[model samples]
Target chain A: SVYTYFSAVAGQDGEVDAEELQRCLTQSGINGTYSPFSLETCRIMIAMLDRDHTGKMGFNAFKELWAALNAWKENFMTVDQDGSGTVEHHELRQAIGLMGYRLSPQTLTTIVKRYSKNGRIFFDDYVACCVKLRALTDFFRKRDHLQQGSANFIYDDFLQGTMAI
Target chain B: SVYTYFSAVAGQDGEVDAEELQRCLTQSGINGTYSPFSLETCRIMIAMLDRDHTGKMGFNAFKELWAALNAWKENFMTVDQDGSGTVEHHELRQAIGLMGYRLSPQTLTTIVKRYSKNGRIFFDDYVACCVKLRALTDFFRKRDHLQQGSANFIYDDFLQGTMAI
Candidate 1:
């Protein structure tokens, strides 16, 4: 369903290109109504997901990204009681619980503060924050491979699958 | 929101070709997708909007269409209660109040049904409808000038303003 939203906006060719992808991602942070993705982020995604260097997005690549992003939307909606389109600063405790971390209220507040200058966690902003959080989580999870982590793995794969884009 | 959607389907060169436009317009109908701009309808739109006869769309032409379309969106949003992302058949009465139209329920239902075989109206359909409505309005308004609906204002102007792409 969410992919339909993205695909609906794709070019008549039924794919989204780099510039177009960049435009959507960049503006989405500011315009919460539209979906979000970024230039560098889209670049990394296509690098990881496109499976070709065309820098164009097909359904398969878009699918994985949506899978990651949609999970956040589902969790965020639960704490967004009023459906104000954003969880307020206070809602962070329950909202980001999906992050799988049990942080102090102060730690949670810090994450909320990072995304909101005005104190409201707009959906896109929440998306941005979660993308960052997920990438960080995956980095530690994947790279701690031998369990005696050197924090270094495949650079290309990291850019493709793990970066904050 | 609409522009982001448009730019996505746009090609790398930032243009939308008739084939590309056709896919979006047609599938958008299924996909409640978008509007019910048929392939021929898309052909007609490109014919009307592709000022250079290039049969391609760039930002300028898109922006103009959007200015007209956005007004329709503004008016439609007022009556979109559930924000289901698609407009329903009966909502046409209040939703189209901005059209300055007064139609019986039967008349309005007939118009909505025209937009869809199964009767659903999405944003792009609204966009398509207004594009058509404005074109006819402009045609009549322009034609009805001091010329008094002259039947013979043909040739060069038609070549410029009206042609099959």
Candidate 2:
């Protein structure tokens, strides 16, 4: 049950934060040389689902987030290719593409630079980046008429929408 | 307007094939170092939109396709960045990602090899590829319950659905 799972993962404060979510995701069948969901990814996940913006999530919000993570877990396994527990730059690029976003080379390089260690991105970081990328792009697409890829927005609107995610 | 454009591009056969689509795409404001849509990409596009599977598209189908192309035109411009007309391997990978698909390194490499010349993919080929990719993934997603990335299907069902596309 979600309550059972939530009870197990929630902290002493009775909510799940980045650290708790990270632990739950890593411990729950998503084996890897590196963790499948990093703290950063968990942080992003929390922020996305957090109703109160306290950087932590309650049981109801956690339920929704778990479903999202479950889907991401399945996708990560498919993208892992050979079960090596990590993906390289090309794999990472394709994984994001699979999720349906297009980034430029410069942007891709920046992602690799930020998330990779010794030129490899572990499962944890991969999920984190994908979540953030999806948030940013989805936010942008709301203003992108017909989803043609560009948008015009007021400066603060852009900042506020992006900042929250 | 669609009729006028279609008549201008269609052969005496009263339909547009890969060659005609290529001509139309390049001529209709999608300038680049090489043509924006390649013959192979056009062929794939035709196959997807051609209701009769005749390797060419008629006026009504052409009209449907034109809207897709117009949207793609906007996306391509956004991804083209420096405006040199063509995108390199990484850029191609990202463009597909932006459209909301993820291809593996091997798959991505195969795509670049098939559509790119001298390690770069131009505008025409890129659009063709994105169109086909979207069709394929959308097809797959229909079978992917909750969009979790994997699906099971009867062999004939898979073959028939994919072959028609």
Candidate 3:
């Protein structure tokens, strides 16, 4: 059924772009009330698993991303704490860190402010925030040729990297 | 009891170095069969939580590391198929990824060979490898002050960073 669903939305190229990824997520009913991630978030999601930088995803990569989404959903539920259907702004740090990004306090505060509404972050916003972090970090890792934890980037390259996500 | 336990091993400065951290981990009875991580691995563990870069850990940091170790232990058990008390070499990548590291194939392979004995990785080796990865990645992240997923490191600084761990 997953493949059947994927094939319907996938183009003749048999691949799903960020748009199709969002469509698939919506149709799959993974997040009923707060689903169908924005194209921006979906682009980051695609980039996270699009190993070749094709800006599109194949069936295998989609499957992997599917699992990751499920994993994140479970984590989100746990971190939501009060069953309020939204996570508190304070819980934001732990939620993102559980996804593996140890962002600095300033960045975290920025995310909290950006993603939350009245100090509570919805599931969609939380997922979008994490996806962006994951995609951005992966991009940097690819350029870290020496794997020494640092990379050199020209101004245009840096601008392009952030802009793409 | 956790704080009480911490106070016992902590020095007059109320901080625990890699040595004391190992002692605490061993006495905590977290890993009975494959117990007490090596000093090198412990140093990485210390560094991962030693945000101040003092090369020593305080009570709160130790508590956080304690929880992480427990979390890793749970993941290790799940990945150790056949209940053999050892993770197969093939399970190495997933095991590390579950702990939040996405290492390259070459790096993963190197770890697989280095940690596994006769194709089986014990709890201690698995924990040590993951701690080292966590420490190393965090080191890089700090240097990546821009949070662009990369840092610039001169040869001496890079060597010192890796060597200290």
Candidate 4:
């Protein structure tokens, strides 16, 4: 559940408070470009994904996020044709199909760069990076061409202040 | 691959070492009577399951253990009637079929006690409890009025205890 994932990223008290959220933004993935992601990108994530306005992320929000990621991840798993734990450049389009996204070449490169570090992206990198930047991640997705999963949150300077704490 | 479960129980060093082994023997599961299993049970587990002989359960061993559990757990998920995230008595026999055990009426109480609290057992509880105490856990397949899957470790532990950090 979200509680467990949240706790994994959160501090000792186990709540993804403002500080924890900021950390997750930068330290989001086991590996990926978006991880240790930019402050600007993290700001967008908190808005849509961090439903707990207490400046913390709650289980409900995490579950929703996980479900979204799980959906893409399963598709990613299947799309990994060789089962070598990575999708080759040519295999990228095939991966998007399973992800419930419209397979776009133009949109694919940003994401390709997003997850591939020297062209080998593990599942964790594929998943964590993609979800955190679904818009940048969604270019390959046709399911919502001109569509977004949910309107993202832009909590203004609150996140930066939280990061300081 | 093996990292997930290994990390689930590991700490500090990247391996489940001698001291950690002792701890896992006792604290392997989310819950169940046998959990916090026993040295006797763990001794049995190590003989076969510890691929890393430095008295550490390494990724390879964890991967093998995980495969066995994953196979059973996948089936266990299906057998969990009512989808309650836990299992009841009637569902017990079917669940054991997926595992490599004999369903011993005699052993059942220990294992049954192994996972159930308030007459229920969770997935994590079922998996960790069953693996650590398979002889007891294996009894089900033997007694099924006697029963099995995955090629198990079946190793004989000559594991050398770590010399200490």
lDDT per residue, candidate 2, A1-165, as tens digits? Answer: 545656788978788767777667666654444545545467678766655645577888877877776666677777778676777777777777777666665556656754566777776666666666666666566666665554554423433344344
The lDDT leader among the candidates is 3
Query: In model 2, how large is the Cα lDDT of residue A63?
Result: 77
Candidate topping TM-score: 3
In the range A95-148, model 3's lDDT, one tens digit per residue, is 876886655564555456445543467887778766766666665666677756
Number of clashing pairs per prediction, in order: 10, 15, 2, 22
TM value for model 3: 0.47
Per-residue lDDT tens digits for candidate 1, residues B93-129, read 6765667654455445435544432235666566555
What DockQ does each prediction reach against the true complex? 0.01, 0.01, 0.04, 0.01
Please report, in order, the local distance difference test score of every candidate based on alpha carbons. Answer: 0.53, 0.64, 0.69, 0.46
Candidate 4 chain A, which ten residues in sequence have the lowest lDDT sum? A156-165
In model 3, state the lDDT of residue B87: 83
Candidate 3: stretches off by over 4 Å: A51-53, A143-150, B1-165
DockQ (model 4, Cα): 0.01
TM-score of each: 0.36, 0.44, 0.47, 0.32
Q: Ranking by TM-score, best first?
A: 3, 2, 1, 4
Q: CA shift at A149, candidate 3, in angstroms?
A: 4.9
Give per-residue CA lDDT, model 3, range B17-60, as digits (tens): 77777787888878868657876567667766766656578988
